[PDB]
């Protein structure tokens, strides 16, 4: 199917406690594959998935030098942001960055991304054309003018359409036994009496990859959107994810309820019901 590569940077000031911490992680789809942490005893871009370990020392040295460069740039950006927002040097602030590329089944670019946030709020984003910018406020408009003057979007576009897509294709091949394998959910329905009058039906999905999944409850074929409790999809720790959806049902009416599961790994969507 389709695939994505993403890098995430977080820069975190801490006045009085040293320089801002810089952490970067890289992902293909829902699989983390590299990390960098300026607070490590010896900071380096480090492998976090088995199929990246085969990259040679030139790769790791180049990535480490780039993250050290980025750490310095984002430490400076934190100082700049204080000036742009008239903020004091005593508070702790955060810059976040996400960028990368999406490709279709044939490996062609679908969409590129490059977005930044300040203190958890959107700051500036490269538009889908990979040539213009959307700035969130008058501070980000200064950055926008700076980046328009220096033709920063042209460099991002070249990266996103070129190296980003080419390295994603390489990683997908090197890690094809996992990155290109969907693990379908293992599913079952449980039943928990609440009172004489009601019971909970909980529809479980376990051990699936990738994380994207749809779990719904129907009653008499009608979606129970407002009355379903849906937990956030959560990592199991072994690559896979977990999710459940629950409804409170009148005693004896259990069989009017059906659970519907959709996942990339399933040839057809599943309909489940409680089976005492």
């Amino acid at each position: 199917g389709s695939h994505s590569m993403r890098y995430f940077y977080t820069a975190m000031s801490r006045p009085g406690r040293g320089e801002p911490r810089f952490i970067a992680v890289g992902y293909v789809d829902d699989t983390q594959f590299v990390r960098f942490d300026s607070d490590a005893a010896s900071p380096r871009m480090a492998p976090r998935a088995p199929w990246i370990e085969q990259e040679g020392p030139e790769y790791w040295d180049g990535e480490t030098r780039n993250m050290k460069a980025s750490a310095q740039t984002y430490r400076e950006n934190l100082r700049i942001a204080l000036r742009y927002y008239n903020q004091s040097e005593a508070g702790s602030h955060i810059i976040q960055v996400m960028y990368g590329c999406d490709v279709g089944p044939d490996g062609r670019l679908l969409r590129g991304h490059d977005q930044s946030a300040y203190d958890g709020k959107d700051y500036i984003a490269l538009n889908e054309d990979l040539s213009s910018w959307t700035a969130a406020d008058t501070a980000a408009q200064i950055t926008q003018r700076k980046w328009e003057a220096a033709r920063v979007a042209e460099q991002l576009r070249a990266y996103l359409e070129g190296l980003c897509v080419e390295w994603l294709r390489r990683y997908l091949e090197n890690g094809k036994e996992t990155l290109q394998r969907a693990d379908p959910p293992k599913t079952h329905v449980t039943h928990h009496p609440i009172s004489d009058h009601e019971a909970t039906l909980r529809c479980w999905a376990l051990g699936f990859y990738p994380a994207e999944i749809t779990l719904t409850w129907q009653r008499d074929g009608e979606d129970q959107t407002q009355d379903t409790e849906l937990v956030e999809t959560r990592p199991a720790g072994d690559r896979t994810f977990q999710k459940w959806a629950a409804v409170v049902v009148p005693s004896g009416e259990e069989q009017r309820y059906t659970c519907h599961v959709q996942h990339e790994g399933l040839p057809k969507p599943l309909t489940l019901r409680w089976e005492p």
């Binding site: 460069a69 700049i80 980003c164």
Partner: peptide, 10 residues
């Protein structure tokens, strides 16, 4: 592979 830091900055 990460994008080369060009360090124009904000």
């Amino acid at each position: 592979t990460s994008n080369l830091q060009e360090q124009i900055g904000w």
